[PDB]
Amino acid sequence: KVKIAVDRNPVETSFEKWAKPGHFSRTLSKGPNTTTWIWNLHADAHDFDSHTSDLEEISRKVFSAHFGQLGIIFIWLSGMYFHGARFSNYEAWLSDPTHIKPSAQVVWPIVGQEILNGDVGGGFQGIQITSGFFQLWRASGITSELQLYTTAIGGLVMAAAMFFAGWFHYHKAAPKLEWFQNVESMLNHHLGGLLGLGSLAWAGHQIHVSLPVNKLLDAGVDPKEIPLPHDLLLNRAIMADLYPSFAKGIAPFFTLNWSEYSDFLTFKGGLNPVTGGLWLSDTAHHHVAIAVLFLVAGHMYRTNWGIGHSMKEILEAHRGPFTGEGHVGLYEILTTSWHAQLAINLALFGSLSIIVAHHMYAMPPYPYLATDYGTQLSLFTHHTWIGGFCIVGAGAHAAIFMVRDYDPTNNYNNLLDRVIRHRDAIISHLNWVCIFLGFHSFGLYIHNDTMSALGRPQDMFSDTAIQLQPVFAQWIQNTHFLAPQLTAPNALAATSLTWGGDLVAVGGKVAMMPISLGTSDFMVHHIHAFTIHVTVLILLKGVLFARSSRLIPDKANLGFRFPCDGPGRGGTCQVSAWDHVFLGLFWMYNSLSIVIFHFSWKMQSDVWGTVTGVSHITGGNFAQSANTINGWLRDFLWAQSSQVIQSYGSALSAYGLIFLGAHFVWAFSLMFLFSGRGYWQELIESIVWAHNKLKVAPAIQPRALSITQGRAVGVAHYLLGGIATTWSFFLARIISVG
């Protein structure tokens, strides 16, 4: 029986507990005695499992927390639309997209920072933005600043509604645990209503607003002269002027004569040649199909009527001879443990963000996006980073489940148990394959460096010496390019230019050309495979040995996050799963930095550039230079760092400042990573003496940071430094040569 269940007025709305720091924890509510308390107060603020044992109260807390997050995001979107309406050059950009740089941030004229307002065109001065909002807004059919302003007000109103919803569903009407545990109903409603009705309503907006406005914009008529969207809904004669299908109305829909809707529901493929983006008619058909698919998918699970599947029954039905009880117990795990759910959802959400990065570079969905090289680099890089972070988080919360929620007396000879029971075999095989990948992938680079240094280029791994061609990827590429002729007859062109074919250019710049894969591409892909496998090794080892190992047989009783178990047994520093997340974070940084470097150099070398033949940004040096480390060091980092290092005295000077600042923060992290808190505690003792001598010793006792906090501060400043460094490099480079 699926129904609404709610408790009335559980928690009174009062400012009392705001005035009592650490009220949520019985330990921290005693007050502060040393400085450690403060850090604890912020570290355990949102760890709701350590607050209460009651799953209902925890579930309510996470629900209202999620509402808070959504309100914050709505404030953020409201801000972006408002700054796009009031402090931007969006209309001028609409009138000339190929020669006006998108800018939506202006600085005030104080202390000389006014220089950051550069000549972006359109009679405007500001910082060129690379988020891609202008291309998104043109694709949505927005033409005036007024519509953006109204969207800003709407998003602010929605943020107020989200914070009211949070307060309401925590303090006034807070859902019960059996409401939260209706996962079959939740899947039905989210697959139908969210994804399904989302893409249906978006396809509605596209077909009714986007297609005509962008068809006129591609035709060339002045945006102010283009009819307003409500007129397009009101007078169907205009819709029939652009696409005659609309003359017949919704009669071909209900009579199943859908072929007459071919004017705006197409299957062209490729890119719009005058605009460099995917066809909005293809995107409209795509969202209609997606809508129908998800609405079909959302009627699968049984709720209040006999029809529908049962999650526990589908899980308990798939059992084989090799796995024993199979998927028995997993339903119970995934309907009582928030951390298991968070692990799964983070893994797929991160992976999905990486897929978003690749598919959005390869098949540019917004108009005048592919030739906004800065926007393309920024979007790819950004979503790749977000992805990687969410994957590391997935490993983290998997381990947190393994320590806090795992209970084998409901989980006995099961998939999870067998994984735990042959973890040594798993980790040893992963270990070997990581060493193998490392040796042969990195060893080719070291081999090439040595041969190149010794004056023997004929002994290198390259396209002219000993070739290592990516035959499989080339075959898949060729197949994908030849697909419209045989295996996808209704396709006018391939889904992406990178498979092969011609060349689409907009405003003299290359939007997309065919990407060729050679020995250097082989080598970087196996580097990627190596780094990903190592990251998986660390995280998976962390989750499999979170409970016990031959070294620490009772590791589970020590918790998820703990420094060690002492210098005995040879030394047990960093045995915790938290410390495995810490190392996985460093390795994730390594992997994704080489990934975004691959993308940057490959695009600037073999894809981007001006059309006269195509003159690429770096002349095509990738195929011969990307086989040695010296080649990456000289032709990529050193060569392309010119723009960032000589950005002083111009509008890009902030990128030089943040280059230096990021280098500094990265280095600053090394003190925390390389040192230990005993030294710092003793130093603080001497300083405390000095303060005592002058009667200024605080009542809250100065303590060195904990071992785990030293590691956390270390990795956070390390990531911030490195990532911000590559950020400044990338943005200064691509804005100056773009």
């Binding site: 129904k3 609404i4 009407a173």
Partner: protein
């Protein structure tokens, strides 16, 4: 209790573990509020067309109901004594007073008969019940002096109301799709019941 025909497939009048605005006391009361506003909406969206077809009101009025000034994209009427925003501010103040004193009697039963309101306090004592205050103005003629007659009148109010709610959703749907008025839809369906249906206007 009025209109209790047992039809609740989605189980929203469950007393167990309720709260918020999903509650028997809020849902039955909002049901009769939507019913009364939809009866007034149905009569008001019919009446200019039938009184202009009967020849009682002139042709400067008798316009379609969505061309009244509700939707100025659908059409507006110049001939009111003021602009529709000048009308709408008077509507804001008036409906704020009315709906807000009604809300206060729902939240605090009987509290609208103590504080001075121009001598209008015995009128708004209400009963020990929302949705049916009564008194010397909300029950002008004593109708429903018998308890069974009062139940019968509440049930007739519920049924006429639900019919008018379906009718007002109908007026919105027909107005969007065929672009004409509901009495014009009557004239077309009674002229050609075969060739003027929903299946023809697609």
């Amino acid at each position: 209790l009025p209109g209790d025909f047992g039809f609740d497939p989605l189980g929203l009048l469950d007393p167990v573990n309720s709260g918020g605005f999903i509650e028997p006391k809020w849902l039955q009361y909002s049901e009769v509020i939507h019913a009364r506003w939809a009866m007034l909406g149905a009569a008001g969206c019919i009446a200019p067309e039938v009184l202009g077809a009967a020849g009682l009101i002139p042709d400067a009025t008798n316009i379609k109901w969505f061309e009244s000034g509700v939707i100025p994209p659908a059409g507006s009427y110049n001939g009111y004594w003021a602009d529709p925003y000048t009308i709408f501010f008077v509507e804001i103040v008036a409906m704020q007073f009315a709906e807000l004193r009604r809300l206060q009697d729902f939240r605090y039963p009987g509290s609208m008969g103590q504080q001075y309101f121009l001598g209008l306090e015995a009128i708004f004592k209400g009963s020990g019940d929302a949705a049916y205050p009564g008194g010397p103005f909300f029950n002008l003629f004593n109708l429903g002096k018998t308890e069974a007659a009062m139940k019968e009148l509440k049930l007739k109010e519920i049924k006429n109301g639900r019919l008018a709610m379906l009718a007002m959703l109908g007026y919105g749907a027909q107005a969007v799709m065929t672009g004409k008025g509901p009495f014009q839809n009557l004239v077309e369906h009674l002229a050609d019941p075969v060739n003027n249906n929903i299946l023809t206007n697609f």
